[PDB]
JSON list of C-alpha atoms in Angstrom, two decimals:
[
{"chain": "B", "resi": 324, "resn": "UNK", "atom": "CA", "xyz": [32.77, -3.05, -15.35]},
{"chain": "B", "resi": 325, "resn": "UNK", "atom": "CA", "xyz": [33.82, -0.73, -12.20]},
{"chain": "B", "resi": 326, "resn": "UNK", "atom": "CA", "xyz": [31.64, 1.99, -13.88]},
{"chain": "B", "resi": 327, "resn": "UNK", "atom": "CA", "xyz": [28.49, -0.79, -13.64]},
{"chain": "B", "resi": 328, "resn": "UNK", "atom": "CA", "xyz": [29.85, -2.82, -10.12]},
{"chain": "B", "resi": 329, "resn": "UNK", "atom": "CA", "xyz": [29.65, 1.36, -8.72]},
{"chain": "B", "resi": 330, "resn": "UNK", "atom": "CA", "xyz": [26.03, 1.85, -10.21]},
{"chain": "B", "resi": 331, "resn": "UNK", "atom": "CA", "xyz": [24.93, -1.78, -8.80]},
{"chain": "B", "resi": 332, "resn": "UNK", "atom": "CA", "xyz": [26.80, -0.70, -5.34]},
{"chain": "B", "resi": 333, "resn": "UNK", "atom": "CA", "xyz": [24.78, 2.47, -5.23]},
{"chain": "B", "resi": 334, "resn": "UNK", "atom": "CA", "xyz": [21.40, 0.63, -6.00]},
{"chain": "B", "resi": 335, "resn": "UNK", "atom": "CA", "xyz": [21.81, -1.38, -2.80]},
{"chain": "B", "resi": 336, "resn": "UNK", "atom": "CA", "xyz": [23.91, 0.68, -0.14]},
{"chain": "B", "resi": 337, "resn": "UNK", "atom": "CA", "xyz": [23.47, 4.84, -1.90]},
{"chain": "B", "resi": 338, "resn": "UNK", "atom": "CA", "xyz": [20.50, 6.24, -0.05]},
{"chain": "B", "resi": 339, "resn": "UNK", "atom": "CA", "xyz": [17.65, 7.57, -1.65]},
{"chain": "B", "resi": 340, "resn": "UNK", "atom": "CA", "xyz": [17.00, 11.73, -0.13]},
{"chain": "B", "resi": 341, "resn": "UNK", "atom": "CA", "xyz": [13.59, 11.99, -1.80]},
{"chain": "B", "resi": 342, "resn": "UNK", "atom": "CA", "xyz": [12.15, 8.32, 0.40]},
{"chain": "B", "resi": 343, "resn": "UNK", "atom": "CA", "xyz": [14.74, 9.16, 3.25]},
{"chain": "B", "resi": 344, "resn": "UNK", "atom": "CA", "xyz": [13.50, 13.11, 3.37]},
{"chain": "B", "resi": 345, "resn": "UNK", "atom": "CA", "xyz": [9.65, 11.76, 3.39]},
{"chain": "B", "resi": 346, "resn": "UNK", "atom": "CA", "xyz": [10.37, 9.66, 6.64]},
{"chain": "B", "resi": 347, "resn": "UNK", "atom": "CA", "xyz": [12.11, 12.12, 8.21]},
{"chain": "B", "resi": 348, "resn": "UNK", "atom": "CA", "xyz": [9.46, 14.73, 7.67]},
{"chain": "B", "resi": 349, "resn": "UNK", "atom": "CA", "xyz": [6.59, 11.18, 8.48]},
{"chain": "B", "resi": 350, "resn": "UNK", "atom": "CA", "xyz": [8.85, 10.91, 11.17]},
{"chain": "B", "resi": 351, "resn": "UNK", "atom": "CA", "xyz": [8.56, 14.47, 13.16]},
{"chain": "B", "resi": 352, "resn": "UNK", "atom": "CA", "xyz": [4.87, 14.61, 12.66]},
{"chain": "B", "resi": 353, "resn": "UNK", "atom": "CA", "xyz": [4.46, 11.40, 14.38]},
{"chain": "B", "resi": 354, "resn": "UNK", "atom": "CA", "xyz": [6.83, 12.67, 17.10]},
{"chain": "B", "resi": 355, "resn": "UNK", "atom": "CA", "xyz": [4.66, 15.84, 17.43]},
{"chain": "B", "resi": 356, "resn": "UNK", "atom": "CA", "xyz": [1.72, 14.02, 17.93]},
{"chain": "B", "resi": 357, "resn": "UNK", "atom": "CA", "xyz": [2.45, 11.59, 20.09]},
{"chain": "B", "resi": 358, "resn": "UNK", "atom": "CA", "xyz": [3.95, 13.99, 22.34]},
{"chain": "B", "resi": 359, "resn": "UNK", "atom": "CA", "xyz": [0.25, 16.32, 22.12]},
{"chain": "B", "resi": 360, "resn": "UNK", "atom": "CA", "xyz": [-1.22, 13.03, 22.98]},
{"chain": "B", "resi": 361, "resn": "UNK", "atom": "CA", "xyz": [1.39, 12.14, 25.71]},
{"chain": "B", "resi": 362, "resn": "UNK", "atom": "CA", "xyz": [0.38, 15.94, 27.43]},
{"chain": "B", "resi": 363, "resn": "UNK", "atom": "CA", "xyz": [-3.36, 15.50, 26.92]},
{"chain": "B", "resi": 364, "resn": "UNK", "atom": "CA", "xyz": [-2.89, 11.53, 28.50]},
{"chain": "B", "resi": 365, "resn": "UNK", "atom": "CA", "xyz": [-0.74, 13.26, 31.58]},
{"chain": "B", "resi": 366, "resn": "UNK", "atom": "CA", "xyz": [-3.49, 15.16, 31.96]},
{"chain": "B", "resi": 367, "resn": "UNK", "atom": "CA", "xyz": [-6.24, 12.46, 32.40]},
{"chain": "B", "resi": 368, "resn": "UNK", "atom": "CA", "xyz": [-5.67, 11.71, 35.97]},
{"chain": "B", "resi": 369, "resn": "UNK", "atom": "CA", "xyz": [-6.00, 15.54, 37.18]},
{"chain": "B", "resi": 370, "resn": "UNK", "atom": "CA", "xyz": [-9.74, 14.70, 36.32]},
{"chain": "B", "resi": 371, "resn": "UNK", "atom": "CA", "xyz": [-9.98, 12.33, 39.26]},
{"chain": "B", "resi": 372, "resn": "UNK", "atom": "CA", "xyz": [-9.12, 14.67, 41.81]},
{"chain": "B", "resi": 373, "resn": "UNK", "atom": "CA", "xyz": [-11.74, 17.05, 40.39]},
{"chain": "B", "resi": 374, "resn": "UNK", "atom": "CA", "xyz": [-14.11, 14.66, 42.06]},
{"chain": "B", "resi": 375, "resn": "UNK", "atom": "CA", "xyz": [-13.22, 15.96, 45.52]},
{"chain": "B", "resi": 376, "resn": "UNK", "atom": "CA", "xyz": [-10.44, 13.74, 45.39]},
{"chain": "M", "resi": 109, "resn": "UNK", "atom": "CA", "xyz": [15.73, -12.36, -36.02]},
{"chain": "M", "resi": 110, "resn": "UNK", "atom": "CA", "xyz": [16.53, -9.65, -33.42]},
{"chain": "M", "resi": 111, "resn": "UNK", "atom": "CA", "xyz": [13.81, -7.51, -33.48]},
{"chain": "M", "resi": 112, "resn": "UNK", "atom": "CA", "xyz": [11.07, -10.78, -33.17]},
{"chain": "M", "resi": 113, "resn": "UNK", "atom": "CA", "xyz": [13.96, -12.24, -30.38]},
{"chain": "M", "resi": 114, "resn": "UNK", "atom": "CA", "xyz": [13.19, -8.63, -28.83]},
{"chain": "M", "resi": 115, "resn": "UNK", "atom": "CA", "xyz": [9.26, -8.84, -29.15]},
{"chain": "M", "resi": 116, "resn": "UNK", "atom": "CA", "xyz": [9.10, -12.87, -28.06]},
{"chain": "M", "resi": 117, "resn": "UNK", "atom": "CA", "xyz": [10.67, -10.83, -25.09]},
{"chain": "M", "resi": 118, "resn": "UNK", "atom": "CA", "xyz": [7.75, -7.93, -24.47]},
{"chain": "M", "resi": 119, "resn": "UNK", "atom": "CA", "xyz": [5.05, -10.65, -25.53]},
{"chain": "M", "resi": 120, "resn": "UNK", "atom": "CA", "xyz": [6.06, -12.86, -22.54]},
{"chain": "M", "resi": 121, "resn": "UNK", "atom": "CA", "xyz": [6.42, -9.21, -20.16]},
{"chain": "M", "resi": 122, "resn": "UNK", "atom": "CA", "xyz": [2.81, -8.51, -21.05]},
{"chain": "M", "resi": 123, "resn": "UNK", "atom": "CA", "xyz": [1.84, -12.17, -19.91]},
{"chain": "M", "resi": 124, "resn": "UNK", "atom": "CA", "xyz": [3.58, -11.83, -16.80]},
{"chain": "M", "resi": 125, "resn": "UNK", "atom": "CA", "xyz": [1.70, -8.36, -16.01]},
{"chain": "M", "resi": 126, "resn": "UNK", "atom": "CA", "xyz": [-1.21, -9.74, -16.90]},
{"chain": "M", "resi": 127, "resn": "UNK", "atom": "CA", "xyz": [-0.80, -12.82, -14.26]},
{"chain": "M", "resi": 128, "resn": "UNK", "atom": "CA", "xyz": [0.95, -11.36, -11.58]},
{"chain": "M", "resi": 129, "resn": "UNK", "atom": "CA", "xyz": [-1.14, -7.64, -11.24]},
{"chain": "M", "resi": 130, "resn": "UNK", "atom": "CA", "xyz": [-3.37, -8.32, -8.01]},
{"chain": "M", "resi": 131, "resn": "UNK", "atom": "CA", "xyz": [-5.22, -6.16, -5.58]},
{"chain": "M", "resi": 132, "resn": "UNK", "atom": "CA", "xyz": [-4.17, -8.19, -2.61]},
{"chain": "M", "resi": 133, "resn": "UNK", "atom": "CA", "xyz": [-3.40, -11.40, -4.76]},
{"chain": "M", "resi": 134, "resn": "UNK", "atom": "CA", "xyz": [-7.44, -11.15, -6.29]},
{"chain": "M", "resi": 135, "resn": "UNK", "atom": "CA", "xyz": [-5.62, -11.09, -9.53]},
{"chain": "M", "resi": 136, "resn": "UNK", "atom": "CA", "xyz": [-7.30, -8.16, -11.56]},
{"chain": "M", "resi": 137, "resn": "UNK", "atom": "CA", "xyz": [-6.00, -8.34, -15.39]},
{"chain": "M", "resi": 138, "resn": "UNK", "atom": "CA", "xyz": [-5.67, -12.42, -16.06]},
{"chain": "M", "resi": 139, "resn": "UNK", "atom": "CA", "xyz": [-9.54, -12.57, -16.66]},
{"chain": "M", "resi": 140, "resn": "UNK", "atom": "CA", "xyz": [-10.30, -14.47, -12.90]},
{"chain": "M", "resi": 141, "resn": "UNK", "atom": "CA", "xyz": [-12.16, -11.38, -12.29]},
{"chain": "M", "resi": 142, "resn": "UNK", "atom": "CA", "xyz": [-14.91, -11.20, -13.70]},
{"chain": "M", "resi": 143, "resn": "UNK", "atom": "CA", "xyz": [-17.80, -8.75, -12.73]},
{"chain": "M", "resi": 144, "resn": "UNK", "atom": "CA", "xyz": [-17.76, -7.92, -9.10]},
{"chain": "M", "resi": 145, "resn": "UNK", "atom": "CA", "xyz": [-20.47, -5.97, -7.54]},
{"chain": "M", "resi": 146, "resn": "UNK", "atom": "CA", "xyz": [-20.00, -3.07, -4.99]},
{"chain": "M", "resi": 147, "resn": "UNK", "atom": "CA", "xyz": [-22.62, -2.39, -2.46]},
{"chain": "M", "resi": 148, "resn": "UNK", "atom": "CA", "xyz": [-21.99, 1.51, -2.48]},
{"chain": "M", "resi": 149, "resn": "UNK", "atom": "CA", "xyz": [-25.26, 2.05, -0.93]},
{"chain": "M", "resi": 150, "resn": "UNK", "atom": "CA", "xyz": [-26.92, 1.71, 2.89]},
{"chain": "M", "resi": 151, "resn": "UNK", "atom": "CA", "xyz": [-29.20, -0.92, 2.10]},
{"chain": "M", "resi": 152, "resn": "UNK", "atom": "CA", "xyz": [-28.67, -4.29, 0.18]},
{"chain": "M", "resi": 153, "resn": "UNK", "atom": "CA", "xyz": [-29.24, -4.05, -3.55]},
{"chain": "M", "resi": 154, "resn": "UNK", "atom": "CA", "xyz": [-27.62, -0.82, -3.80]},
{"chain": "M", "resi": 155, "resn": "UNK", "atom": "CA", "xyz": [-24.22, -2.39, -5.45]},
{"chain": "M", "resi": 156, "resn": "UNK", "atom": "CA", "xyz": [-22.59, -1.65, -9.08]},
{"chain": "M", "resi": 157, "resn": "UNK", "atom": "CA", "xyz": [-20.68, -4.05, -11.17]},
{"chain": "M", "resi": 158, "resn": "UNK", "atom": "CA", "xyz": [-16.99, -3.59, -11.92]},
{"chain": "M", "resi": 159, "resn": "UNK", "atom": "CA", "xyz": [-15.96, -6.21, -14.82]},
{"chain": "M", "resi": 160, "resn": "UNK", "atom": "CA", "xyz": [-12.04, -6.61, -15.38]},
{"chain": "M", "resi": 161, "resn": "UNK", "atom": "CA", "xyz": [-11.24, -8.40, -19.30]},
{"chain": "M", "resi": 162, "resn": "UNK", "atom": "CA", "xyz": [-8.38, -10.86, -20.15]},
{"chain": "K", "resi": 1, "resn": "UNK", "atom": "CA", "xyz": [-36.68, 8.67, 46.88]},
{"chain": "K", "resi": 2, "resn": "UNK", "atom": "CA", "xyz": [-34.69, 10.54, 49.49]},
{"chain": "K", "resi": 3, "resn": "UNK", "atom": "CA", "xyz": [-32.55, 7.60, 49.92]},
{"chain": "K", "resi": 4, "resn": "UNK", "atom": "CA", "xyz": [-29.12, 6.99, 51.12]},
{"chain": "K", "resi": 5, "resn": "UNK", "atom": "CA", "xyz": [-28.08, 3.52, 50.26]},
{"chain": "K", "resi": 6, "resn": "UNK", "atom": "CA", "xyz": [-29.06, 3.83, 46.33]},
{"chain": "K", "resi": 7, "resn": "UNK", "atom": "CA", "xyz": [-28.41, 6.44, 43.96]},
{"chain": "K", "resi": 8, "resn": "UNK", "atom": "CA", "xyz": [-29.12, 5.21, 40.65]},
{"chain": "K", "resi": 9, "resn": "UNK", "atom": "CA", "xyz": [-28.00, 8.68, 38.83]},
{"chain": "K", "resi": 10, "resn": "UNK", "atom": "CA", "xyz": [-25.01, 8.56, 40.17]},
{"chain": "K", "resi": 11, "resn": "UNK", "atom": "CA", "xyz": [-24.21, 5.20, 38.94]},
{"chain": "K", "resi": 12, "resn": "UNK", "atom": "CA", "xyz": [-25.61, 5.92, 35.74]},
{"chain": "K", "resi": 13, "resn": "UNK", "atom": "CA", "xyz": [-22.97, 8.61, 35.61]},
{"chain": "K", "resi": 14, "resn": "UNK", "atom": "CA", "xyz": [-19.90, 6.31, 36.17]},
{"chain": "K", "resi": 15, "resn": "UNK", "atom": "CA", "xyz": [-21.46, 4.60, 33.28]},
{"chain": "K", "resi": 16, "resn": "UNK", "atom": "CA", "xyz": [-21.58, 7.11, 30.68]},
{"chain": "K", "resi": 17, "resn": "UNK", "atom": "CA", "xyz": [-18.65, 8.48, 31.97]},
{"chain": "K", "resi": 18, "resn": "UNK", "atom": "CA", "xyz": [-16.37, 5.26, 31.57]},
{"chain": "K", "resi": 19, "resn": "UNK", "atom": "CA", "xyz": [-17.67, 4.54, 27.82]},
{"chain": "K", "resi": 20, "resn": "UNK", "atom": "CA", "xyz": [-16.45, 8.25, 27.29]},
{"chain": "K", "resi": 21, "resn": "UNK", "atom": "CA", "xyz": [-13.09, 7.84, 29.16]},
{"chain": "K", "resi": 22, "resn": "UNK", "atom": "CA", "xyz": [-12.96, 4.34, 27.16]},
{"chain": "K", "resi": 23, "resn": "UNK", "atom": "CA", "xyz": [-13.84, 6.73, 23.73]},
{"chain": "K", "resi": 24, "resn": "UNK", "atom": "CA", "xyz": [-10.85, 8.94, 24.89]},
{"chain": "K", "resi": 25, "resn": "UNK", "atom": "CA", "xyz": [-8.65, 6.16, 24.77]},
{"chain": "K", "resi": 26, "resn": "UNK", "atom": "CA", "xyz": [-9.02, 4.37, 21.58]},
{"chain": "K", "resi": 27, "resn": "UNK", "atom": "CA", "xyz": [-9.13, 7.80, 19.99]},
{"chain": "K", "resi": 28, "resn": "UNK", "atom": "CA", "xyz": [-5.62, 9.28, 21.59]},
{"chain": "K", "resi": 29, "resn": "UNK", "atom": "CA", "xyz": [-4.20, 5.64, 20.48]},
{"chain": "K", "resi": 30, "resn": "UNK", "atom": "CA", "xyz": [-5.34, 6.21, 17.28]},
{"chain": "K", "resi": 31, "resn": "UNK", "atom": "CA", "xyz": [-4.03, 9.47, 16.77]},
{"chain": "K", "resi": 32, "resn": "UNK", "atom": "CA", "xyz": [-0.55, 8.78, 18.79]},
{"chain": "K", "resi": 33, "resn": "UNK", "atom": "CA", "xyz": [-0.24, 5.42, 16.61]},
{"chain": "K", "resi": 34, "resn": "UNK", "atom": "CA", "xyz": [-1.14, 6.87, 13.13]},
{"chain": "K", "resi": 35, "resn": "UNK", "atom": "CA", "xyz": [-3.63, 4.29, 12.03]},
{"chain": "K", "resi": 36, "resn": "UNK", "atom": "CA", "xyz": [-6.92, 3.35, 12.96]},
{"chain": "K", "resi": 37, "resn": "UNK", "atom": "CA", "xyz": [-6.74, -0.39, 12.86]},
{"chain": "K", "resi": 38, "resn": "UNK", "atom": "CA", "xyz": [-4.39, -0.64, 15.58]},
{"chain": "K", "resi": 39, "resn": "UNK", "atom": "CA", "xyz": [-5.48, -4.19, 17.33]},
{"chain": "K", "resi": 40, "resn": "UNK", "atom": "CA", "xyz": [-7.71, -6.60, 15.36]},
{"chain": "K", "resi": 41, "resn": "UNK", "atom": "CA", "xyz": [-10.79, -5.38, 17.95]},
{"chain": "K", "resi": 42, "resn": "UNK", "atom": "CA", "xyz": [-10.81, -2.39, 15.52]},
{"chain": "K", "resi": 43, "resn": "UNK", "atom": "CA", "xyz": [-11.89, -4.46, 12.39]},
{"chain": "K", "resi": 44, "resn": "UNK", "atom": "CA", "xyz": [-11.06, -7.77, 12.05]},
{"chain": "K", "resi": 45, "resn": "UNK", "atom": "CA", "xyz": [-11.38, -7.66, 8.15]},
{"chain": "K", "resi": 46, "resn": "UNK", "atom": "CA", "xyz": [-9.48, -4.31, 8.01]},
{"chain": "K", "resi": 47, "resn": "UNK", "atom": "CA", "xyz": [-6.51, -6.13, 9.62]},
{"chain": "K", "resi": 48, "resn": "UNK", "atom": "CA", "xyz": [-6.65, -9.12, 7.65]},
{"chain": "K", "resi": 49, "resn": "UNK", "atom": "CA", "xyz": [-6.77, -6.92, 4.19]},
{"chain": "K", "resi": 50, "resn": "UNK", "atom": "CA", "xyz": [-4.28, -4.71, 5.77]},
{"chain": "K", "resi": 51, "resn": "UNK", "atom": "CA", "xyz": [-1.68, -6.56, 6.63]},
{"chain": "K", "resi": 52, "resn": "UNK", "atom": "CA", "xyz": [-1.75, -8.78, 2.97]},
{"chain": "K", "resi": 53, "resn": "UNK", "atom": "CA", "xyz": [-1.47, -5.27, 1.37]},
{"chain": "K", "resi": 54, "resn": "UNK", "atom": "CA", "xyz": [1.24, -4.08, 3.77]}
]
């Protein structure tokens, strides 16, 4: 039984690396870009002032 | 007796593949699929016909 | 011509220019966001399918 309850435990608390290593990596990339985009967006106004203010 | 208890088991498992597999719940492998056509081209009439069997 | 209360290219510059500013947006949210059917506006069907599939 414990050697079964511990397997069942696992199956619903134990992490999984290879899912939980994919979202991390998902999870930078995303990061990254919307931080390029962020810089790029911050950048949008200085356009206006291009038009002699 | 164990053996056909065992296959009465994988007979139903096949059913319930069979009536459950879906594309979005257009279920693909019960037979309610028949042929389907796909418009792969720019203009209408340009479509091929995908047929799914029981 | 050589008028001072009209000037027609100039306001068909603030035109083009807004649908690209506009262009600029949808594409930055689309790349920040990850997906391309962010709000239904995108494709109504796309969501629909979408989100049954999600």
């Amino acid at each position: 039984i414990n050697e079964n309850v511990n397997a069942s435990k696992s199956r619903i608390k134990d992490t999984d690396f290879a899912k939980e290593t994919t979202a991390l990596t998902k999870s930078q990339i995303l990061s990254q870009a919307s931080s390029s985009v962020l810089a790029q967006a911050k950048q949008a106004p200085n356009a206006a002032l291009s038009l002699l203010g | 007796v164990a053996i056909q208890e065992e296959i009465t088991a994988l007979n139903d498992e096949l059913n319930r593949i069979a009536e459950t597999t879906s594309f979005g719940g257009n279920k693909l492998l019960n037979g309610t699929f028949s042929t389907k056509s796909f418009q792969i081209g720019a203009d209408n009439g340009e479509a091929v016909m995908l047929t799914l069997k029981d | 011509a050589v008028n001072v209360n009209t000037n027609v290219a100039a306001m068909t510059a603030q035109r083009y220019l807004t649908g690209a500013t506009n262009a600029q947006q949808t594409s930055m949210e689309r790349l920040s966001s990850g997906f391309k059917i962010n709000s239904a506006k995108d494709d109504a069907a796309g969501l629909q399918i979408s989100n049954r599939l999600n």
